[PDB]
Design a protein around this motif. Structure first.
Motif, PDB file in Angstrom:
ATOM      1  N   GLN A  52       3.444 -26.674   7.876  1.00 34.40           N
ATOM      2  CA  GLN A  52       4.675 -26.973   8.599  1.00 34.40           C
ATOM      3  C   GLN A  52       4.423 -27.822   9.835  1.00 34.40           C
ATOM      4  OE1 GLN A  52       6.735 -23.289   9.417  1.00 34.40           O
ATOM      5  NE2 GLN A  52       7.003 -22.774   7.254  1.00 34.40           N
ATOM      6  N   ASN A  53       5.486 -28.453  10.319  1.00 30.36           N
ATOM      7  CA  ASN A  53       5.471 -29.236  11.562  1.00 30.36           C
ATOM      8  C   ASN A  53       4.495 -30.415  11.545  1.00 30.36           C
ATOM      9  OD1 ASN A  53       7.437 -27.388  12.826  1.00 30.36           O
ATOM     10  ND2 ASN A  53       5.711 -25.961  12.964  1.00 30.36           N
ATOM     11  N   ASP A  54       4.672 -31.292  10.557  1.00 33.50           N
ATOM     12  CA  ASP A  54       3.860 -32.507  10.381  1.00 33.50           C
ATOM     13  C   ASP A  54       2.353 -32.262  10.257  1.00 33.50           C
ATOM     14  OD1 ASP A  54       5.993 -34.462  10.245  1.00 33.50           O
ATOM     15  OD2 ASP A  54       6.201 -34.315  12.427  1.00 33.50           O
ATOM     16  N   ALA A  55       1.980 -31.048   9.863  1.00 31.46           N
ATOM     17  CA  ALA A  55       0.581 -30.703   9.645  1.00 31.46           C
ATOM     18  C   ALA A  55       0.069 -31.310   8.341  1.00 31.46           C
ATOM     19  CB  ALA A  55       0.400 -29.198   9.639  1.00 31.46           C
ATOM     20  N   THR A  56      -1.240 -31.542   8.277  1.00 25.61           N
ATOM     21  CA  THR A  56      -1.874 -32.119   7.094  1.00 25.61           C
ATOM     22  C   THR A  56      -2.397 -31.015   6.177  1.00 25.61           C
ATOM     23  OG1 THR A  56      -2.646 -33.860   8.615  1.00 25.61           O
ATOM     24  CG2 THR A  56      -3.370 -34.004   6.318  1.00 25.61           C
ATOM     25  N   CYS A  57      -2.104 -31.140   4.885  1.00 18.10           N
ATOM     26  CA  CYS A  57      -2.532 -30.158   3.894  1.00 18.10           C
ATOM     27  C   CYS A  57      -3.750 -30.643   3.115  1.00 18.10           C
ATOM     28  CB  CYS A  57      -1.388 -29.829   2.931  1.00 18.10           C
ATOM     29  SG  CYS A  57      -1.640 -28.316   1.977  1.00 18.10           S
ATOM     30  N   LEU A  58      -4.753 -29.776   3.010  1.00 19.55           N
ATOM     31  CA  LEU A  58      -5.985 -30.093   2.295  1.00 19.55           C
ATOM     32  C   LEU A  58      -6.012 -29.399   0.945  1.00 19.55           C
ATOM     33  CD1 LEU A  58      -8.432 -29.552   5.312  1.00 19.55           C
ATOM     34  CD2 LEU A  58      -7.837 -31.806   4.390  1.00 19.55           C
ATOM     35  N   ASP A  59      -5.947 -30.198  -0.111  1.00 25.48           N
ATOM     36  CA  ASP A  59      -5.988 -29.687  -1.478  1.00 25.48           C
ATOM     37  C   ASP A  59      -7.425 -29.325  -1.849  1.00 25.48           C
ATOM     38  OD1 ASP A  59      -5.184 -28.908  -4.013  1.00 25.48           O
ATOM     39  OD2 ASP A  59      -4.899 -30.945  -4.769  1.00 25.48           O
ATOM     40  N   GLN A  60      -7.729 -28.032  -1.771  1.00 27.72           N
ATOM     41  CA  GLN A  60      -9.079 -27.520  -1.997  1.00 27.72           C
ATOM     42  C   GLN A  60      -9.166 -26.709  -3.290  1.00 27.72           C
ATOM     43  OE1 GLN A  60      -9.789 -25.357   1.649  1.00 27.72           O
ATOM     44  NE2 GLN A  60      -9.519 -27.195   2.893  1.00 27.72           N
ATOM     45  N   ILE A  61     -10.377 -26.274  -3.638  1.00 25.96           N
ATOM     46  CA  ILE A  61     -10.604 -25.492  -4.854  1.00 25.96           C
ATOM     47  C   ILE A  61     -10.164 -24.040  -4.654  1.00 25.96           C
ATOM     48  CG2 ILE A  61     -12.273 -24.795  -6.632  1.00 25.96           C
ATOM     49  CD1 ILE A  61     -14.045 -27.214  -5.371  1.00 25.96           C
ATOM     50  N   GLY A  62      -9.002 -23.708  -5.213  1.00 27.93           N
ATOM     51  CA  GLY A  62      -8.464 -22.349  -5.157  1.00 27.93           C
ATOM     52  C   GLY A  62      -7.773 -21.976  -3.860  1.00 27.93           C
ATOM     53  N   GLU A  63      -7.604 -22.955  -2.972  1.00 26.90           N
ATOM     54  CA  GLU A  63      -7.001 -22.724  -1.656  1.00 26.90           C
ATOM     55  C   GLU A  63      -6.429 -23.992  -1.021  1.00 26.90           C
ATOM     56  OE1 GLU A  63      -9.731 -21.419   1.364  1.00 26.90           O
ATOM     57  OE2 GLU A  63     -11.357 -22.735   0.697  1.00 26.90           O
ATOM     58  N   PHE A  64      -5.684 -23.802   0.066  1.00 22.09           N
ATOM     59  CA  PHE A  64      -5.238 -24.898   0.913  1.00 22.09           C
ATOM     60  C   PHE A  64      -5.575 -24.576   2.356  1.00 22.09           C
ATOM     61  CE2 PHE A  64      -1.587 -23.234   3.222  1.00 22.09           C
ATOM     62  CZ  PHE A  64      -1.221 -22.120   2.476  1.00 22.09           C
ATOM     63  N   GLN A  65      -5.725 -25.616   3.170  1.00 20.68           N
ATOM     64  CA  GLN A  65      -5.919 -25.446   4.607  1.00 20.68           C
ATOM     65  C   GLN A  65      -5.058 -26.425   5.389  1.00 20.68           C
ATOM     66  OE1 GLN A  65     -10.238 -25.603   4.945  1.00 20.68           O
ATOM     67  NE2 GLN A  65     -10.342 -23.434   5.509  1.00 20.68           N
ATOM     68  N   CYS A  66      -4.459 -25.931   6.467  1.00 25.12           N
ATOM     69  CA  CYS A  66      -3.584 -26.740   7.303  1.00 25.12           C
ATOM     70  C   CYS A  66      -4.291 -27.179   8.583  1.00 25.12           C
ATOM     71  CB  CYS A  66      -2.305 -25.971   7.643  1.00 25.12           C
ATOM     72  SG  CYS A  66      -1.304 -25.480   6.217  1.00 25.12           S
ATOM     73  N   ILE A  67      -4.272 -28.485   8.835  1.00 26.21           N
ATOM     74  CA  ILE A  67      -4.746 -29.038  10.099  1.00 26.21           C
ATOM     75  C   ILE A  67      -3.515 -29.262  10.969  1.00 26.21           C
ATOM     76  CG2 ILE A  67      -6.312 -30.703  11.190  1.00 26.21           C
ATOM     77  CD1 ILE A  67      -6.829 -31.655   8.120  1.00 26.21           C
ATOM     78  N   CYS A  68      -3.369 -28.424  11.985  1.00 22.70           N
ATOM     79  CA  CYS A  68      -2.168 -28.415  12.804  1.00 22.70           C
ATOM     80  C   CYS A  68      -2.078 -29.603  13.754  1.00 22.70           C
ATOM     81  CB  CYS A  68      -2.065 -27.111  13.601  1.00 22.70           C
ATOM     82  SG  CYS A  68      -2.001 -25.592  12.628  1.00 22.70           S
ATOM     83  N   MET A  69      -0.856 -30.098  13.931  1.00 22.10           N
ATOM     84  CA  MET A  69      -0.550 -31.099  14.942  1.00 22.10           C
ATOM     85  C   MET A  69      -0.545 -30.394  16.301  1.00 22.10           C
ATOM     86  SD  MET A  69      -0.008 -34.378  14.492  1.00 22.10           S
ATOM     87  CE  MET A  69       1.023 -34.892  13.124  1.00 22.10           C
ATOM     88  N   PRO A  70      -1.166 -31.014  17.330  1.00 24.50           N
ATOM     89  CA  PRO A  70      -1.312 -30.406  18.659  1.00 24.50           C
ATOM     90  C   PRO A  70      -0.066 -29.660  19.142  1.00 24.50           C
ATOM     91  CG  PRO A  70      -2.327 -32.549  18.677  1.00 24.50           C
ATOM     92  CD  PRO A  70      -1.786 -32.353  17.282  1.00 24.50           C
ATOM     93  N   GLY A  71      -0.265 -28.426  19.601  1.00 21.90           N
ATOM     94  CA  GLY A  71       0.828 -27.580  20.073  1.00 21.90           C
ATOM     95  C   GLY A  71       1.258 -26.522  19.075  1.00 21.90           C
ATOM     96  N   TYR A  72       0.733 -26.615  17.855  1.00 25.41           N
ATOM     97  CA  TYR A  72       1.069 -25.679  16.786  1.00 25.41           C
ATOM     98  C   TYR A  72      -0.156 -24.917  16.288  1.00 25.41           C
ATOM     99  CZ  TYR A  72       5.586 -28.085  16.692  1.00 25.41           C
ATOM    100  OH  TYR A  72       6.807 -28.619  17.031  1.00 25.41           O
TER     101      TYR A  72
END
Ligand SMILES: [Ca+2]
Ligand SMILES: [Ca+2]
Ligand SMILES: [Ca+2]
Ligand SMILES: [Ca+2]
Ligand SMILES: [Cl-]
Ligand SMILES: [Cl-]
Ligand code: NA
Ligand code: NA
Length: 120
Positions: A52-72
């Motif tokens: 959420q909130n313009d964060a970047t989603c990483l398509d990984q093996i069996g999971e996802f990870q969010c890189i948050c935009m500053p402040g989130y």
């Protein structure tokens, strides 16, 4: 008569999936993050846009990870970080939450961003 497709030259299950022989055909026991009859689909854990909130989603093996935009913050970057939680305003100043930022409304007579300046 049955032919063991798993015992053949190549493994018909992609991405190191376990081949299990059946009578007439075969089946694939896929590893976590792979789907399909031959494990040929790399499951997109970002397909539903979980970050959420313009964060970047990483398509990984069996999971996802969010890189948050500053402040989130958070697993989905759903939390707007409360900069007033650590009580940054000295001398009991009013804190106003922003994005990766806080706003101190200083008491009389202090100034200005952390309310540390004593005007006497
Ligand atoms: Ca078979
Ligand atoms: Ca994936
Ligand atoms: Ca904030
Ligand atoms: Ca600041
Ligand atoms: Cl995450
Ligand atoms: Cl200051
Ligand atoms: Na935290
Ligand atoms: Na200050």
């Amino acid at each position: 008569q049955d032919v063991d497709e798993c015992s053949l030259g190549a493994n018909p299950c992609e991405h190191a999936g376990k081949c299990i022989n059946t009578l007439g055909s075969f089946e694939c026991q896929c590893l976590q993050g792979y789907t399909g009859p031959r494990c040929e689909i790399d499951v997109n854990e970002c397909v539903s846009n979980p970050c959420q909130n313009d964060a970047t989603c990483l398509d990984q093996i069996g999971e996802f990870q969010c890189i948050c935009m500053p402040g989130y913050e958070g697993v989905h970057c759903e939390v707007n970080t409360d900069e007033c939680a650590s009580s940054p305003c000295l001398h009991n100043g009013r804190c106003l939450d922003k994005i990766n930022e806080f706003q101190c409304e200083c008491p009389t007579g202090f100034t200005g961003h952390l309310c540390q300046v004593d005007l006497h």
